[PDB]
Amino acid sequence: SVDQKAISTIRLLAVDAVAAANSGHPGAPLGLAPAAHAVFKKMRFNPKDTKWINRDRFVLSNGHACALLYSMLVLYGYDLTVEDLKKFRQLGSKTPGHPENTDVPGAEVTTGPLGQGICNGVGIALAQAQFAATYNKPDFPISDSYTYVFLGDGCLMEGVSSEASSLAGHLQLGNLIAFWDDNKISIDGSTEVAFTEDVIARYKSYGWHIVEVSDADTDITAIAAAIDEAKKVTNKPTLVRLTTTIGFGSLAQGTHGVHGAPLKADDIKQLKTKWGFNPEESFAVPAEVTASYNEHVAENQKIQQQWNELFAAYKQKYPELGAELQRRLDGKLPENWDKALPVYTPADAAVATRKLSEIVLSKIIPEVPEIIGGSADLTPSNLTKAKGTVDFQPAATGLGDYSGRYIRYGVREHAMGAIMNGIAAFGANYKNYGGTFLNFVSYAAGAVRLSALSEFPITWVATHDSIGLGEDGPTHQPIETLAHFRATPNISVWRPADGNETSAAYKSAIESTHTPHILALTRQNLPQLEGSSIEKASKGGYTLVQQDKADIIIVATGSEVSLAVDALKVLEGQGIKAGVVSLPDQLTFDKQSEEYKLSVLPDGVPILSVEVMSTFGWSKYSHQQFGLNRFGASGKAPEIFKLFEFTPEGVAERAAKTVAFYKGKDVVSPLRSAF
């Protein structure tokens, strides 16, 4: 039949792509081609408009199987061709060895690191539910799309998927339909060696619906019926168990050897001949398959065309919501939204930056509907909920509604990070955030790095940034954390010192379209600074205290800027004149012009950095570094600062030593380099 021919075409494209690269993963593509064919025939999508907001989404969580995804995209006429498949895994191609949303048309997210994609799917589904609750009206199903996810045993072993699956079951996300490739093989061999749990019983315990397809190597009727069944269960996410043979059809089917290396040439020949293809030919695309797939595309395009008319009619029937929706689909924030950002003066009271963050959120959430966010069981400590908002919960629970704004992630930092990526991937201008302690952002590193690689504008509200948190002690106090994330490409790491800098950090985080943000915020109170503003802090680094005859410049962040200002006064009594630079975001600073940066960190003067955690990175901006390169301590925070000499006198002593060390030396800006 044509369906059989399509499945064979998909299988053979994937095998031929791996063969051409002499690298990659043929096993899961062979096993999942029937399911991929069946799912894509049920999906609504436009290969010519990858951003249609009411498309169904597909996520390949077992990203190593991406020859399968690329084959589907090529067959359906996305902006990806057979010539791209022939360049699978080759430098600069559109077909990298794991899917990247920045590079691959039709890749909603970046997968490859196991466990992430299913969590991203939870976030796409969460966003769709929130979006639909916000905009849909009687006779106006603006958003009614599904989220389809393929995942394997490896994703099911990764703890992040357990976190997201528990939460998705709690949230009753009925438009999420995941498919487990139950092939009983991972890299080390049979799952009997390490993964003998009853996966189905576990998913039932989370509140998921289950459909089992016992012959997923051939039974596309049952796979399609499983989708229809899942669509009837509107209050539970569904897991479809696809019992498959890894490498189905290969001489080496059912073995770990077919997971991750190219097939032998004679194996590929026998695959072709068994399925009616020419063993001398590679990258065959039977015209019957193209015709069948084109029929489905044409139907989907007519569905989108009708959706566009529904949207036009919605704008007439619901003028206010319709204009808001239009603006969001155009990728624009509300005009002058930033006028809601709080502004402080040096006469205002000292405030912890966690509390300043609460105040920002309480002003901007009412102004910017596409802001949603939550905390990983730290709401009253991170201060991430605006008073008066409703939680995102299924209404059946009585605890919230899908139109709610605030997500109770539970103690699930890693899944929160990956869910945030999915919410961003949904689109519609969502600007979403997640709170935890800075030290526990590290639990989510797998997802955070993917925020950076995927270019998603997600925001971590990362409070309790340092030893300033005090008594909870060294298991809670960051040392390495800023260095880790600053060393990752494409992460803005804001460490605001005061009220105005906190508003600048949020301006950046909400305006972002391609750069994730981490906002490192304090437990302890900090004074409002003389010389700060949103305008200056928006440059990432700025001269706070200008001293034209400086003997030294002190560059600092966050809680250490006030410390530097107090040290400047001690230094004056020692006959040393200092300037102060505040560097709330190193990435934003780095992106300024060379001349602006030199106006902040000029030649001809020693520069000392002060920040109460690792000194890594700081030589970009300073000649000497005063930091904390050991673990912290459990005690009252001011006593910990005194112990480590992060005091006005301790900073002054190191500044004076720095001045002396450079006496008789020629000093050029740390910004200069040989290449």
Ligand X SMILES: Cc1ncc(C[n+]2c([C@](O)(CO)[C@@H](O)[C@H](O)[C@H](O)COP(=O)(O)O)sc(CCOP(=O)(O)OP(=O)(O)O)c2C)c(N)n1
Q: How far apart are CA 16 and CA 322, in angstroms?
A: 47
Pairing state between β 552-556 and 607-610: parallel
Site string for Ca ion, 135-154 (x = CB under 5 A): -----------------xx-
* In the complex, minimum distance from the CB of residue 108 to ligand X, in angstroms, rounded to a whole number: 18
Torsion angle defined by CA atoms of residues 464, 390, 129 and 398, in that order, rounded to the nearest 10 degrees = 120
Of 226 and 444, the one with the shorter C-beta distance to ligand X is 444
Q: How far apart are CA 601 and CA 553, in angstroms?
A: 8
Give the CB-nearest residue to Ca ion: 153
Which residues inside 276-315 make contact with ligand X, applying CB under 6 A? none
List 378, 450, 610, 651, residue binding ligand X (CB under 6 A): 378
* In the complex, minimum distance from the CB of residue 585 to ligand X, in angstroms, rounded to a whole number: 24
129: Cβ–Cβ under 8 A, 6 or more apart, which residues?
171, 173, 175, 392, 402
Query: Can you list the pairs that 40-43 forms with residues at least 24 positions away whose Cβ atoms lie under 8 Å?
Result: 40/72, 40/76, 40/296, 41/224, 41/296, 42/148, 42/224, 42/227, 43/146, 43/148, 43/300
Query: Candidates 187-195, 457-465, 523-531, 572-580 — which segment interacts with its own copies by CB under 8 A?
Result: 187-195
List 108, 153, 217, 267, residue binding ligand X (CB under 6 A): 153
| 413 catalytic per annotation | yes
Gyration radius of the chain's alpha carbons: 28
Q: Does residue 197 bind its own copies (CB under 8 A)?
A: yes
Q: Does residue 194 bind its own copies (CB under 8 A)?
A: yes
Which residues inside 88-127 make contact with its own copies, applying CB under 8 A? 89-93, 96-98, 100, 110-115
- Nearest in space to 597 (alpha carbons), one of 528, 496, 673, 501: 673
List 55, 241, 259, 363, residue binding ligand X (CB under 6 A): 259
Considering CB distances under 5 to 8 angstroms, the limit depending on partner class, which of Ca ion, ligand X, its own copies, none binds residue 532?
A: none
Ramachandran sector of residue 383 (left: φ over 0; alpha: ψ -120 to 50; beta: rest): left
Secondary structure element (H or E) that encloses residue 545, with its range: strand 542-545
Q: Does residue 241 bind its own copies (CB under 8 A)?
A: no
Which residues inside 515-544 make contact with ligand X, applying CB under 6 A? 523
Which residues inside 636-675 make contact with ligand X, applying CB under 6 A? none
Query: Could you give the residue ranges of the DSSP H alpha helices within 581-671?
Result: 586-590, 594-600, 637-643, 648-661
Please provide the distance, in angstroms rounded to a whole number, between the alpha carbons at the two ends of the chain: 62
Phi, psi of 555 (to 5 degrees): -105, 135
Of 344 and 437, the one with the shorter C-beta distance to ligand X is 437
Q: Does residue 510 bind its own copies (CB under 8 A)?
A: no
Which residues inside 172-191 make contact with ligand X, applying CB under 6 A? 181, 183, 185-187
Which residues inside 425-484 make contact with ligand X, applying CB under 6 A? 440, 443, 472
Q: Does residue 480 bind its own copies (CB under 8 A)?
A: yes
Pairing state between β 542-545 and 517-520: unpaired
Query: Candidates 111-119, 415-423, 509-517, 601-609 — which segment interacts with ligand X by CB under 6 A?
Result: 111-119
Site string for its own copies, 363-382 (x = CB under 8 A): ------------x-xxxxx-
Joined tokens for residue 459 = 């925001």
Quickly list DSSP for 187-207: TTEEGGGT--S-HHHHHHHTT
C-beta neighbour count of 277 within 10 angstroms: 20
Of 188 and 295, the one with the shorter C-beta distance to ligand X is 188
Query: Candidates 106-114, 219-227, 394-402, 423-431 — which segment interacts with ligand X by CB under 6 A?
Result: 106-114
* In the complex, minimum distance from the CB of residue 199 to its own copies, in angstroms, rounded to a whole number: 7
Q: Does residue 475 bind its own copies (CB under 8 A)?
A: yes
Query: Candidates 74-82, 265-273, 573-581, 612-620 — which segment interacts with its own copies by CB under 8 A?
Result: 612-620
List 131, 307, 314, 440, residue binding its own copies (CB under 8 A): 440
Q: Are 508 and 431 in contact (CB under 8 A)?
A: no
Quickly list DSSP for 397-436: GTS-BTT--EEE--S-HHHHHHHHHHHHHH-TT-EEEEEE
Secondary structure element (H or E) that encloses residue 59, with its range: strand 57-60
Considering CB distances under 5 to 8 angstroms, the limit depending on partner class, which of its own copies, ligand X, Ca ion, none binds residue 207?
A: its own copies
CA angle 638, 643, 647 (to 5 degrees): 60
Q: Are 129 and 237 in contact (CB under 8 A)?
A: no
Q: Does residue 112 bind ligand X (CB under 6 A)?
A: yes
Secondary structure element (H or E) that encloses residue 129, with its range: helix 116-135
Kindly provide the b/e burial profile for residues 607-645, where b requires at least 16 CB atoms within 10 angstroms of the residue's own CB: bbbbbbbbbbbbebbbbbbbbbeeebbeeebeebbeebe
Binding residues: 25, 64, 112-114, 153-154, 183, 185, 259, 354, 381, 413, 440, 464, 472, 523
Binding residues for Mg(2+): 153, 183, 185
Which residues inside 410-429 make contact with its own copies, applying CB under 8 A? 410-412, 414-415
List 2, 214, 636, 649, residue binding its own copies (CB under 8 A): 636
Which residues inside 166-195 make contact with Ca ion, applying CB under 5 A? 183, 185-186
Q: Are 279 and 268 in contact (CB under 8 A)?
A: yes
Of 12 and 479, the one with the shorter C-beta distance to its own copies is 479
Give the interface size with ligand X as a residue count (CB under 6 A). Answer: 27
Residue type, position 494, single letter: W
* In the complex, minimum distance from the CB of residue 287 to its own copies, in angstroms, rounded to a whole number: 31
Q: Are 451 and 417 in contact (CB under 8 A)?
A: yes
Considering CB distances under 5 to 8 angstroms, the limit depending on partner class, which of ligand X, Ca ion, its own copies, none binds residue 62?
A: ligand X
Considering CB distances under 5 to 8 angstroms, the limit depending on partner class, which of Ca ion, its own copies, ligand X, none binds residue 523?
A: ligand X
Which entry of 108, 158, 413, 560 is annotated as an active-site residue? 413
Q: How far apart are CA 315 and CA 324, in angstroms?
A: 9
Query: Candidates 214-222, 314-322, 464-472, 554-562 — which segment interacts with its own copies by CB under 8 A?
Result: 464-472
Q: Does residue 27 bind ligand X (CB under 6 A)?
A: yes
Which residues form the catalytic set? 413
> Under the rule (CB under 5 A), what is the footprint of Ca ion?
152-153, 183, 185-186
- Sites of contact with ligand X (CB under 6 A): 27-28, 62, 64, 112-114, 152-155, 181, 183, 185-187, 246, 259-260, 377-378, 381, 411, 440, 443, 472, 523
